[model samples]
Target: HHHHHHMVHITLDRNTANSWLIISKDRRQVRMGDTHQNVSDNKERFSNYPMVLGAQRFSSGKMYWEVDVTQKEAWDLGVCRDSVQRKGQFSLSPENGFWTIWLWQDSYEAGTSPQTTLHIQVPPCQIGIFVDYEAGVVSFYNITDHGSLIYTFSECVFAGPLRPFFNVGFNYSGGNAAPLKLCPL
Candidate 1:
């Protein structure tokens, strides 16, 4: 059987952006705000997630999106259950409704129950995220190498709709000031 890949355009949901994160006017790029804003406290706003969600949701089948993470030293991108808590300290692991891959200080990692170390020898300028919700799988690819597999999370159980999540981590210094951009297909 041949597998078909479905591409989707995702936009950052400004309602979910943290106080210190800035979403571009087009809602396609997100970067660390130069200064934190005194945003109102709300359940929809992430308190510790420090990230943003996509305006769309996926509950089944193949779904894909790409992100331009060039020059970023720390950031994370993946999918989260629509019901996942947006406040307080939540683990970026499958058990906590988050299945993500992150980069920190040049090291790539995937969040699992025990956390898995990804063997991404080189940082990818563009990262491709593919999800098979019904199959319980989420995969990441290095877009620069013909979509070479970077990491995969298996046995993912989606209790509800899954939404794309992004985080340009907290300590965003000038070195990693580049905005995380959602690539147009």
Candidate 2:
């Protein structure tokens, strides 16, 4: 398990990102830019949220990846259903095709219907996401603890593909200005 053979390669998708987000040239890093870039228009692009999806999508088996969340105060990290309504303001719930855990106000919460608040001793410097599509499970890990478990979303009725979901989030007085880096796996 220490080896990186099972680690999946994930990169942020440019076309799916909001214009307010500044995708890195390599597309592995995304940051909330102060001003919108001269981005092209696309129907799949999110017009209201500062979020982005990965270039790769999953439908079977198991895969894992890591994200660099250090220096970021607010953000959303996890996976979303392939057809999770990208047009308008939608709820961040599993029923709405979202399965994520976010950090805000120095606290963490899963984006579940009941919104479970996670009380971990230490904040994570790197976050890990592991998805077992066949088993209908998605697990979050605090990589700082040698990849210890943080939370898990199970019994997911995944009817379609799942894309790596990320919300760099809105600028909070530049508190979340740091880029969300996707670590090489």
Candidate 3:
């Protein structure tokens, strides 16, 4: 068995931004629970930026797996379930105490935006993943690639849960803008 420390950082250049993670799963379609009504149709005061994350439950071989979706090229990020689907934004996580991490830029909508990337590599043992998005780019890397991202995406997320449960998360900065530093706790 092999275990190592991993860290991912994200820097936000603008105010509001949009981002998502691409998760790998075994199921055809993952269930991300219900949606909310945080974003309305009002253009004057649209919903603030958000970071969305979710997981899909799947079964592979003898172990369970899940995938997390960072962003969808077709839809926008919002709490309204019907609004998101009808509008073309794919759901990431469940509703209620848990909303997906949808990083946003007031200038860019959910459907049209970009994100950072980070990859994890640790031979054959176990791989630890890390990601951090801030400013306007999403940066991610595994244990081996430190300070550099394996890949960058206009839309990305920590897509996972190819096994049993998928976990997604997002942090809100009332009126603050800072980099995202994600590492194992």
Candidate 4:
């Protein structure tokens, strides 16, 4: 029931040329099928943006999770790291497991990777994210494409669990018409 109602309340529309970066039911969903890159990088990657809206004040011991397009344009899950923003996030090609975690490195940015996460090399139709603070786990799952696990159970040991000060922002490259909404479980 939680899943059905959640989907009904929030629809990812490409026709509604409006990108919505919103927090729903205390969580936010940033949705759009547009290409965007770093504030400085020219590399383009398709983003299926959806994140818990608002500054999620995560304590050093809380769970922080995310659901977004993988390097392959497939859906994948990952845990937030204290160095996430500092690592300089970047996009991965859909065929390359879409591992954004590795793409941000300066060396990798120049196009060199000695190793990479062996994730499913397919874009997902839908994505789901979960963070269990008690279990100290952050994970993501591919819902629509092939029902695969992108990433899982990374210890979210934050230097300081971010406080509830995060927001989900959306943009559709002037193509989408409406914003996507998120419902809490």
User: In model 3, where do residues sit more than 4 Å from their true spots?
Assistant: 1-134, 154-185
Name the candidate, 2 or 4, with the larger TM-score value.
2
lDDT of 2 by residue, 115-162 (tens): 998967878989988888999988898888777778999998878999
Query: Who wins the TM-score comparison?
Result: 2
Question: Per-prediction TM-score, please?
Answer: 0.92, 0.95, 0.20, 0.39
Candidate 2 vs 3: which has more TM-score: 2
Models, CA RMSD each: 2.0, 1.5, 16.3, 10.5
Ranking by TM-score: 2, 1, 4, 3
Query: 1-185, model 4: which lDDT tens digit per residue?
Result: 02222121222222111232322343344443344322232222122333322233344343323244332221223333322332234442222222233222111121114435445465443455444555555445555555456555344343434221111233323433233333333
The sequence of per-residue lDDT tens digits that candidate 3 reaches over residues 1-185 is: 12123222212211111223221232222212224333334321113333322222222112211122323211122221222221233444432111122323322222222332212342111112322222122222233333333323233332322211122233233232222222223
**Candidate 1 C-alpha lDDT tens digits along 1-185:** 11225888898888888888888889999988778866776778888756889999897789988999988889999999988888788778888899899998778889876778887666699998989887899989988777788888888887899999999886546687788999988
Candidate 3 global lDDT:
0.25
User: Which window of 10 residues has the lowest lDDT sum in candidate 3?
Assistant: 8-17
| lDDT (C-alpha, whole model) for all candidates | 0.84, 0.87, 0.25, 0.33
Candidate 4 residue spans exceeding 4 A from truth = 1-53, 60-115, 145-147, 163-185
Superior by TM-score: candidate 1 or candidate 4: 1
